[PDB]
Design an enzyme around this catalytic site. Sequence first.
Site, PDB file in Angstrom:
ATOM      1  N   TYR A 224       0.834  -1.207   0.000  1.00 30.83           N
ATOM      2  CA  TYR A 224       0.000   0.000   0.000  1.00 30.83           C
ATOM      3  C   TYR A 224       0.868   1.256   0.000  1.00 30.83           C
ATOM      4  O   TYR A 224       0.509   2.260  -0.599  1.00 30.83           O
ATOM      5  CB  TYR A 224      -0.936   0.031   1.209  1.00 30.83           C
ATOM      6  N   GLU A 254     -12.107  24.826 -14.096  1.00 29.95           N
ATOM      7  CA  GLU A 254     -12.175  25.124 -15.514  1.00 29.95           C
ATOM      8  C   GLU A 254     -12.043  23.850 -16.351  1.00 29.95           C
ATOM      9  O   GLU A 254     -12.735  23.698 -17.365  1.00 29.95           O
ATOM     10  CB  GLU A 254     -11.102  26.139 -15.897  1.00 29.95           C
TER      11      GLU A 254
HETATM   12  N1  LIG Z   1      -4.488   2.148  -2.729  1.00 35.36           N
HETATM   13  C1  LIG Z   1      -4.823   1.721  -1.481  1.00 35.36           C
HETATM   14  N2  LIG Z   1      -5.854   0.849  -1.335  1.00 35.36           N
HETATM   15  C2  LIG Z   1      -6.215   0.403  -0.102  1.00 35.36           C
HETATM   16  C3  LIG Z   1      -5.477   0.858   1.072  1.00 35.36           C
HETATM   17  N3  LIG Z   1      -6.043   0.270   2.152  1.00 35.36           N
HETATM   18  C4  LIG Z   1      -7.068  -0.490   1.707  1.00 35.36           C
HETATM   19  N4  LIG Z   1      -7.161  -0.414   0.368  1.00 35.36           N
HETATM   20  C5  LIG Z   1      -8.179  -1.088  -0.453  1.00 35.36           C
HETATM   21  O1  LIG Z   1      -9.444  -0.702   0.104  1.00 35.36           O
HETATM   22  C6  LIG Z   1     -10.345  -1.825   0.077  1.00 35.36           C
HETATM   23  C7  LIG Z   1     -10.659  -2.227   1.507  1.00 35.36           C
HETATM   24  O2  LIG Z   1     -11.276  -1.128   2.172  1.00 35.36           O
HETATM   25  P1  LIG Z   1     -10.625  -0.371   3.410  1.00 35.36           P
HETATM   26  O3  LIG Z   1     -10.420   1.098   3.145  1.00 35.36           O
HETATM   27  O4  LIG Z   1      -9.466  -1.158   3.958  1.00 35.36           O
HETATM   28  O5  LIG Z   1     -11.878  -0.580   4.416  1.00 35.36           O
HETATM   29  P2  LIG Z   1     -12.472   0.521   5.415  1.00 35.36           P
HETATM   30  O6  LIG Z   1     -12.926   1.698   4.587  1.00 35.36           O
HETATM   31  O7  LIG Z   1     -11.478   0.786   6.508  1.00 35.36           O
HETATM   32  O8  LIG Z   1     -13.787  -0.292   5.902  1.00 35.36           O
HETATM   33  P3  LIG Z   1     -13.937  -1.348   7.146  1.00 35.36           P
HETATM   34  O9  LIG Z   1     -12.531  -1.694   7.570  1.00 35.36           O
HETATM   35  O10 LIG Z   1     -14.747  -2.430   6.505  1.00 35.36           O
HETATM   36  O11 LIG Z   1     -14.688  -0.571   8.214  1.00 35.36           O
HETATM   37  C8  LIG Z   1      -9.587  -2.954  -0.618  1.00 35.36           C
HETATM   38  O12 LIG Z   1      -9.884  -2.848  -2.013  1.00 35.36           O
HETATM   39  C9  LIG Z   1      -8.135  -2.611  -0.370  1.00 35.36           C
HETATM   40  O13 LIG Z   1      -7.276  -3.166  -1.372  1.00 35.36           O
HETATM   41  C10 LIG Z   1      -4.363   1.796   0.834  1.00 35.36           C
HETATM   42  O14 LIG Z   1      -3.682   2.234   1.785  1.00 35.36           O
HETATM   43  N5  LIG Z   1      -4.114   2.169  -0.433  1.00 35.36           N
END
Ligand SMILES: Nc1nc2c(ncn2[C@@H]2O[C@H](COP(=O)(O)OP(=O)(O)OP(=O)(O)O)[C@@H](O)[C@H]2O)c(=O)[nH]1
Lengths: 440, 426, 69
Positions: A224, A254
């Site tokens: 990540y 714009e």
């Molecule tokens: N690019 C990126 N994607 C991420 C990251 N952390 C999680 N994801 C993606 O986000 C999705 C998972 O959601 P999260 O944001 O971890 O979940 P949350 O919003 O914390 O929701 P809950 O934990 O279910 O309460 C998956 O598709 C992961 O691959 C990050 O730091 N960077």
Amino acid sequence: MRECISIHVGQAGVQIGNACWELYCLEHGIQPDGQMPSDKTIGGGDDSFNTFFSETGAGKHVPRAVFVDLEPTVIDEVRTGTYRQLFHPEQLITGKEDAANNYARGHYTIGKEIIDLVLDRIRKLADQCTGLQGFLVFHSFGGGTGSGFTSLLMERLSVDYGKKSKLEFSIYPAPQVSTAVVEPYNSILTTHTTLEHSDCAFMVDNEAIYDICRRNLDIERPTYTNLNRLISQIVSSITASLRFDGALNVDLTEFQTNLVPYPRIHFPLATYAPVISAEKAYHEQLSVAEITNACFEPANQMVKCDPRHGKYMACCLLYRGDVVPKDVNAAIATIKTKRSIQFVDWCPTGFKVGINYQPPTVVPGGDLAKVQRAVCMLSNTTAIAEAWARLDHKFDLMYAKRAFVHWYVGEGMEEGEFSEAREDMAALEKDYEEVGVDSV
Amino acid sequence: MREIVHIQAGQCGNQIGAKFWEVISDEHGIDPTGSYHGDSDLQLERINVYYNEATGNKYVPRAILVDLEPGTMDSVRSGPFGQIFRPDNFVFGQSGAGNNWAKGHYTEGAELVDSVLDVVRKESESCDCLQGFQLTHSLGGGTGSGMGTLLISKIREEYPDRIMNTFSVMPSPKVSDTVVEPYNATLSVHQLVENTDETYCIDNEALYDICFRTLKLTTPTYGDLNHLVSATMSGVTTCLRFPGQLNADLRKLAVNMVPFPRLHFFMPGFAPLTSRGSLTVPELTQQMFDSKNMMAACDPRHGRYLTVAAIFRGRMSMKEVDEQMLNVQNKNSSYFVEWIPNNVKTAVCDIPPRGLKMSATFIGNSTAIQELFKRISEQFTAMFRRKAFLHWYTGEGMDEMEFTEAESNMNDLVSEYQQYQDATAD
Amino acid sequence: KREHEREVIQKAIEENNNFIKMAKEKLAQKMESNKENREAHLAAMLERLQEKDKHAEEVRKNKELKEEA
Ligand SMILES: Nc1nc2c(ncn2[C@@H]2O[C@H](COP(=O)(O)OP(=O)(O)OP(=O)(O)O)[C@@H](O)[C@H]2O)c(=O)[nH]1
Ligand SMILES: C=C/C=C\[C@H](C)[C@H](OC(N)=O)[C@@H](C)[C@H](O)[C@@H](C)C/C(C)=C\[C@H](C)[C@@H](O)[C@@H](C)/C=C\[C@@H](O)C[C@@H]1OC(=O)[C@H](C)[C@@H](O)[C@H]1C
Ligand SMILES: Nc1nc2c(ncn2[C@@H]2O[C@H](COP(=O)(O)OP(=O)(O)O)[C@@H](O)[C@H]2O)c(=O)[nH]1
Ligand SMILES: [Ca+2]
Ligand SMILES: [Mg+2]
Ligand SMILES: [Mg+2]
């Protein structure tokens, strides 16, 4: 005036937030303690960087940002890490129990317990603005909080701020780094719920970014951290017009005028160049022509799809660093005589150009080479609907058997909400077909 | 924090329960006195999931020990980590359950269940944010099976929004000759299908076979079987106990693993399983997906996977694990249902089990688990058609109707697995 | 022309206010329906559990009457 408030939601939103705000500080010469030696006006100002940073009388430059997550462990790392002094504790908001990868818990069961507090904190940021322009909302499609709480928040923001602009950076799921089988459910639900409440949304396909890191930066198994540093460069390109001044600088709003021909068609495709390692960049200067050409290479897109198989409704080029119009014009001319760039018949074919002269920055310990110039292309292409198609199909496979649906129903949802969301997505896919058809 | 409360009932439950705490205490650097003496902050980061912190920097398992007889728990108290458990958390009777599910569930067990609930309440009250519960027990006896499933129903009533997890040891004639065990097992499964969110099927049949066939042990002891169980329980809880992204709490695990509420019976697996004096990522991966490595006596190639979690432990190439997990899914695509996309999730934890460089643990939700239930069902009906030994149960107040209902429900569960096994995307 | 200019801006105001009102009402309806649905789910669960307690009393009573033999 012209303030922008950023809201980072759930793990993906927060960690991408970490990367962006670290990068902004480096771009503006702001130290981790918030001090900015170059800023001679203490405790206020209407400089360009003040769109994203407020100032205290003690000379601290504070992000106009709220971080929100339904569990505490991700935001705790902000509270205890390098840029902890940057944020007032009230800007960092956490609950105890997350949404368990379940849209219903993010939007309803767990989210409702914290939504009023989050809105109160946002209001405190809004009250300090003299000309608030709008919100930038960072979140995943796939997580329970990123999907469900973001939807709830966007709905409530429409009510409390009316038609004040709301832009999203949305993280579209990929199997290489996904953590829930139900992410397609969550994605369709939040896309349906947020669609009328968002003015413009930049989707970031984790698989596209994953591929770019592997291919262009030679990273074996991107983390990540790897993904987020790249994403922050793209986010920074897009917000640079808001944070910097300059004669050839063109405001994001714009570009937005050109990018959104109908309210629902508001999903630009971002392409960014150059993404190159230090080892490859050394002694190898990439010109305006070379980075411009790279924008029309699908391998460099933030969302996997094939614009060569779709139609354009807009093309915008956002340059930063050592770039002048003469070179841009020549580069564009070459491209028009060699590339699969077909526009719909009801749209003008000119490329819209903006140039920000402040050169790109990189974070220490990063994978990207420091370069003299960079470009982010923002296009409105029918091809982006491919991303919806792939997601909608995974949805259909599971929903036909009602797999995992009991998890959502148990938290109070109805099957009615699923089919309503999926029908909205079908209509959206059809909208993208229709805008591509020639006029009679 | 996100606390789990652990309950262990009956002989089997307290035996494998004790081994669980010994094994994870070692992993977390916790000694028999509750003091921490580890060498890695990764050990303490999520320590509170399973341990209470007391005065003197002491760590105390959030564990409750239950039995209708003093025997096994007296020896628990005499075990290596015996002094680590909270003395007030020992709840026991004097009667015994006599391998009678009805005594455990309706009679003796019911007389004791309230005092157990008092302790559950006290542990739950001082939880910052309770996740739910895990129970260890056998299904073949009287206390773990009968009183165990009674406790589940009572706890559910007071904590209806929390996750209920069980480690349930399935009976086999290869290990125990107690004739009424298929009665007790079937009556128990009847409860589990209705009242748990996730159940690990620890099948004594499979444990014996692994020890006898693979490990070439002519005479497997409960000691041998329980090493397999503790290795497995350590593995399937690593995502709960150490920092990580995948299935990091009980509810996220259930949401990834359970597509229909009743189908929550998991086939656990472990690698390596190799005889003394007889280990690449490719070799680990192939082994964990072989039937010979399953802790439930079912062949996964006799059905299809609804969902799978794989946990690799130790220092290894993440790139290589990703490639091998892709490879196994590609070569075996027929055995994963097509209408649940991306239904295999993989985690890697840097910290290996004690004494191993690398290990893999497997959690399968496979329709092939019906073979386990069909086996119990065959043994059940051979006794029930003769009405053999029923007076043991009816003498406690039960009637034959409940046996019929329990039998039908378990037979329904089998039909349901077959339904989703036969289902296609088109 | 002035009359028209007034009508255009009051129209803009009316449409924005109606968007807000709709959004607010839709959210209230959804949250109420969700609350009711979840509460009913939990209630059904506890009702079944209470039936179980009922059956257990019945079993112990049945044993009691047969030991009066
Ligand atoms: N690019 C990126 N994607 C991420 C990251 N952390 C999680 N994801 C993606 O986000 C999705 C998972 O959601 P999260 O944001 O971890 O979940 P949350 O919003 O914390 O929701 P809950 O934990 O279910 O309460 C998956 O598709 C992961 O691959 C990050 O730091 N960077
Ligand atoms: C009989 C085989 C013994 C050892 C094997 C060579 C293997 O050891 C190594 N280092 O690879 C082990 C892992 C076997 O594959 C397993 C079948 C062992 C297994 C779980 C059960 C057997 C039935 C049982 O008799 C047991 C008493 C035998 C040996 C144990 O001392 C091995 C240790 O026990 C563990 O539980 C941990 C995984 C780890 O500490 C492991 C080194
Ligand atoms: N794997 C394993 N199985 C056990 C152990 N102790 C008992 N069993 C099994 O559990 C069943 C008997 O139940 P038990 O727990 O002894 O009865 P209870 O004390 O009334 O719950 C039989 O199938 C035994 O084979 C143990 O330590 N390990
Ligand atoms: Ca200033
Ligand atoms: Mg989260
Ligand atoms: Mg026994």
